[PDB]
Structure 1
C-alpha cells in the first residue's frame, strides 16, 4: 500500500416512518509516523497527556515502533477532540476522517438493529444481516511520502467512495417503545429472568416490534454479559405448550370428524398411555365441548381428539404455519427449533404433539403462526424491512376453519372461566395462554386483535417468573392487553367492541 482507504458513509437505518435507528456520525482517528516522532521527543509528554497516555509508556511505544511508518494513536474521537491534538503541531501526527455509528433509540431496538465494530463493519442484527446494502464501497487515495514515511500530499482520489444505501425497517418505533416499556415492567413485576415480545402485521408479514429483556446500550458497550446480548425472540427455543392447541383444533375441524359443539370426556383429568400419564391442570371436568377444551386448556381433551384424527393431520398444520420451520429471514444466529416428524406416529407422540410438549419453536415462529390464523388462514412471508409491495401469501388453513378457530379463541378470552386478563379495552381480542415447565417455568400468551377484522398478532414470553404467579394467563396475558391496546390506537384501528 502506497494508498490509504477512504471509509464510505454507512447507510442510514430507520424505522418504518423514517425515525433514525443507526446514524453514521463523523469521527476522527489519529495516527502517527514514529520516524518523524523520533526527531521531536521533547513534544512526546504533551502528546501523551493529550491522548490520555502515561508519559513513559507512550515514549516506550514510540521507541519500540521507531522503524515503523504507521501506528494508530487513538480511534473514533469527536472532530473537535481530534482537531485539538492536531493543533499541538506535533511533527508526524496525522488525522483520518472516519465514521462511527450512533443509535438514537439505544437499548430500545438493540437486538433488532445490532451494532458495528471499531472498523464500522456490521457485527449483529440488521447491521450484519444487511451489511452489503449498508456498507457501500471504501474509496482509495494515492499518497506521496518521502523515504521517512512523511505524508507530503494526496496525489489523487484513485477510487471515489460510494456511500451505503438507506434501510427502512418494518419496526414501528412507537410500538417498539410501547412493547419495550411493558415487557420491562412485566419482568420487574414478576421477578422474571428474561422475556420476549413480538408484534406482527397479519396482512403484510411485517415485524412491527421485536423486544427482549435483558437488553444493553449499543452506544455504551464495555462489560456486556452474553445474557443481555441474546436476541431471544429469534435465538431462544422453547416448548410452546398449550399455545399450539389452536392448530391441533384446526386439524380436527378440517378433518370432517369434528365440530365446535362436539363433546369429549376428560374425566378424571388424567389419561394413561402405557407408562406415560397425560395430566390436566384442572381436574374437575367430565364432558367438555371443543371451546371448553381450549378454555380449560385440557391436555386430555386435545389428546383424545388427536387420537381420533391422527397426528399426521396435526403435524401438517403445524408444519404449514411454520412451527419449527425456517423463517426465510437471513437473520444472524436465528434458530429453527424442532417439529418432530414420525414415519408412523405412536400413541404417546400423537398426544404430546397435539399439546406442544413434543416441539421447540421461537417467539417469531409462534407470532407468524398466529398471524396466519388471524389472516383467515393465509401466511404472508415474514419481513424485517418495510413492505411497500406485499407478496402473495400462502393459504395454509382453510378460511372457514380459520374463521371458526378465531371465534373459539375470542371465547377463550371473553367467555366465563376464560383468559379475562388478556381482554383489550374497547376491542374484541382472541388468544391462548401457555405455561411450560423448564420448578422453573416459561409463561406464554399468543393472540390477535381486533377479533372481527384482525390486524395484529402478538406473542409474550416471560421466562422464569419468580413470584407466586407463573401461569401465562396471569403473567403474560396482562402484557398482551396493554401492548395490544396501545398498538391498535397508534395504528388507528377502529374499536370493534362498540357499546
Structure 2
C-alpha cells in the first residue's frame, strides 16, 4: 500500500436558528466536540488508555476491548458531542491516534412547550420530527470538504486545504407565537389533569393569514432529554389523530343550506319526536325535547333530525362541496412527516343514510388542523387562506369558498350557540363575544370532546380547536381564547 494518500474529511455546517414569529429562539445549534481515533496509532499508547477512557466516561476494559477488536481499522468514533471544554481536555492528553471534529448539537430553549411543532434532530444533526424535518434542507446548509494527507498506517500527516467551505443553514421564523403557545400548553395540561384525561390537542390559527399561532399536544416530552421517552409522548396528535368530527361540521352543512336558495335562518324544521326513520335506519337526536326549531336552534340543540331533513332537501352534493372546499379530508400542504389527510368519501348516488351521516359529521374523518383550517375559512368571512407553519409577511389571495353573506349569517348562528339560553355557556370568553360549536368525535384507526370556534364573533381574528381524548373542551377554549386575544391586543367587543 502507498506511503502517502490524499483523503477527504467532511466539515459539518452550522444548522439554521429556528425562532418564533417574534424572533424568540426555539432551536439553536450549540458547538460540540467529537473525538475519532486511528486504532493502529492508539495501539502504540496502551498505558494512556485508562486515563483516556475516564475522560470519555467509558469503562476501562470495555474501552480497551473496543480498541483491540478494531486494531485492523484506521478510523473509529471514540465519542460524539462532548462540550468544547471537555474535548479540549482530551486533546490536551496528546494520546497518539486521537483526533477531534468540531460539530453542532441542538438546544431547544422552550423544551416540552413546543416539542411537537419544532421537533428534533438525530445523532447526525438531521431533522427527525416536526419543523426540523419539514425544513431540513433550509436549516441544514451544506457540509464542507477538507483534504488531509495520510501515510500507509492511516496517520494524518497534515491538513492540506479546505476544497469546499461549509455553508451555514438559514434562519427560520415560525408562525408560532411562543406567548400563545405557553398559554395553550399550560391550559390544556391543567384541563387534562383536572379532568383525569390522558391526551389532547389545541390548535390556534390566525384566520386572516393562515398562520398556526399555537399547536400543543399532550402528552409531550422534553426534546433536550429523550432518555425515558415514551412513543405515546412523541405523537403529533393535532396533525395525525383522525376522527369523525360530529356536530362540529354542522356549520358547513348549514352553509350549504343557506347557499342553496331554499333556506333562511328564520326557517323552521319539525324534529319531533327526536327520531326519524329512513328505511331500516333510525336517526336519533341527543336531546329529544323539541318540535319546531329554527335553523339556529337546530345548531344549539345539535339536532341530527333537523340537519338531516335540511340535507335531504338540498342534497348531499352541496354539503360535500362545502366540506371539500374548506379542506376537510384534504392535504394541508404543511409537509410534516406523519401528517394524515383523513377521508371525505364521495358518491355518485347519495342514499338518505349516507346524506344524513355526512350532514351530522359521522360520514367523514378529519384532523384537528383540518377542522381549525375550516373554522378559519368560515371566520375569515368565507375566504380560505393556505395553512402556514412559517411567519407570513405577504398574505396569499386565498379562495372565496363560502359567500361573505352566508359566512356572516353562520358566524351569527355560532355566536348564538355560545351565548343563547340552552347554549354552550362554558365556551363564553371573558371580555369578548365568541362563536363556536361542541361535538363528540369518534376516533378512526374511542371518543374525543371537541370544541371549535373563533373570536371575536362580530370581527373574527382567531380560530381554535380543542380536542380532549374521552363538554370539558369548552372551558379550555374559553380560557385560551381570552388570553390569546389579549396577547394580540384585540379590542374587547
TM-score range, shorter chain: over 0.9
The C-alpha deviation readout for 1:428-455, integer Å capped at 9, x for no partner, is 1000000134594210000000011100
How far did residue 216 of structure 1 move?
0.9
SS of the equivalent of 1:75 reads strand
The C-alpha deviation readout for 1:239-272, integer Å capped at 9, x for no partner, is 1000000000001111111111111111111112
Among 154, 157, 165, which residue is 1:152 paired with? Answer: 157
CA distance in 2, matches of 1:241, 1:144: 68
CA distance in 2, matches of 1:208, 1:380: 14
How far did residue 275 of structure 1 move?
2.4
Partner of 1:459: 465
How far did residue 91 of structure 1 move?
1.4
SS of the equivalent of 2:329 reads coil
CA distance in 2, matches of 1:182, 1:267: 40
How far did residue 274 of structure 1 move?
2.2
CA distance in 1, matches of 2:23, 2:158: 40
The C-alpha deviation readout for 1:379-416, integer Å capped at 9, x for no partner, is 01111100001110100000000000000000000101
CA distance in 2, matches of 1:436, 1:54: 53
CA distance in 2, matches of 1:268, 1:301: 11
Partner of 1:72: 77
CA distance in 2, matches of 1:186, 1:192: 8
SS of the equivalent of 1:119 reads coil
The C-alpha deviation readout for 1:354-387, integer Å capped at 9, x for no partner, is 0001110010000000000000000011111000
How far did residue 193 of structure 1 move?
2.4
Determine if contact 2:245/2:442 at 8 Å carries over to the other structure: no
Matched, 1:480 2:465: no
Determine if contact 2:435/2:457 at 8 Å carries over to the other structure: yes
CA distance in 2, matches of 1:334, 1:57: 43
The C-alpha deviation readout for 1:265-318, integer Å capped at 9, x for no partner, is 111111122222211111111111111111111111101111111101111100
How far did residue 148 of structure 1 move?
2.3
CA distance in 2, matches of 1:320, 1:55: 65
Partner of 1:492: 489
CA distance in 2, matches of 1:273, 1:223: 53
Partner of 1:468: none
Q: Which moves more between the two structures, 416-425 or 433-442?
A: 433-442
SS of the equivalent of 1:386 reads coil
CA distance in 2, matches of 1:222, 1:300: 52
Determine if contact 2:148/2:161 at 8 Å carries over to the other structure: yes
The C-alpha deviation readout for 1:164-210, integer Å capped at 9, x for no partner, is 01100111110111111111111111111211100000000111011
User: Structure 1: any 5+ residue segments left out of the alignment?
Assistant: 465-473
The C-alpha deviation readout for 1:310-359, integer Å capped at 9, x for no partner, is 10111110011011011122221211000011101000000000000111
The C-alpha deviation readout for 1:64-108, integer Å capped at 9, x for no partner, is 111211111111111011111122221111111100011111111
The C-alpha deviation readout for 1:203-224, integer Å capped at 9, x for no partner, is 0011101110111111111232
Q: Which moves more between the two structures, 102-111 or 41-50?
A: 41-50
Determine if contact 2:275/2:282 at 8 Å carries over to the other structure: yes
The C-alpha deviation readout for 1:142-176, integer Å capped at 9, x for no partner, is 11223222223211011000110110011111011
CA distance in 2, matches of 1:348, 1:67: 72
CA distance in 2, matches of 1:53, 1:35: 20
The number of aligned residues is 487
CA distance in 2, matches of 1:390, 1:290: 34
Partner of 1:467: none
Q: Which moves more between the two structures, 116-125 or 143-152?
A: 143-152
Among 219, 222, 234, which residue is 1:217 paired with? Answer: 222
Determine if contact 2:31/2:105 at 8 Å carries over to the other structure: yes
CA distance in 2, matches of 1:485, 1:178: 10
CA distance in 2, matches of 1:241, 1:303: 13
Superposition RMSD in Å: 1.3
CA distance in 2, matches of 1:399, 1:54: 70
- Structure 1 runs of 4+ aligned residues shifted over 3 Å read 437-440
SS of the equivalent of 1:359 reads coil
CA distance in 2, matches of 1:239, 1:190: 22
CA distance in 1, matches of 2:441, 2:7: 62
Among 263, 286, 304, which residue is 2:268 paired with? Answer: 263
CA distance in 2, matches of 1:153, 1:230: 48
CA distance in 2, matches of 1:437, 1:391: 34
- Normalised by the length of structure 1, the TM-score is 0.96
CA distance in 2, matches of 1:56, 1:449: 65
The C-alpha deviation readout for 1:109-156, integer Å capped at 9, x for no partner, is 111111111001111111111111111100011112232222232110
CA distance in 2, matches of 1:325, 1:400: 25
Q: Which moves more between the two structures, 223-232 or 117-126?
A: 223-232
Partner of 2:431: 426
SS of the equivalent of 2:244 reads coil
Q: Which moves more between the two structures, 66-75 or 141-150?
A: 141-150
Q: Which moves more between the two structures, 237-246 or 270-279?
A: 270-279
How far did residue 52 of structure 1 move?
1.9
SS of the equivalent of 1:164 reads coil
User: Structure 2: any 5+ residue segments left out of the alignment?
Assistant: 1-5
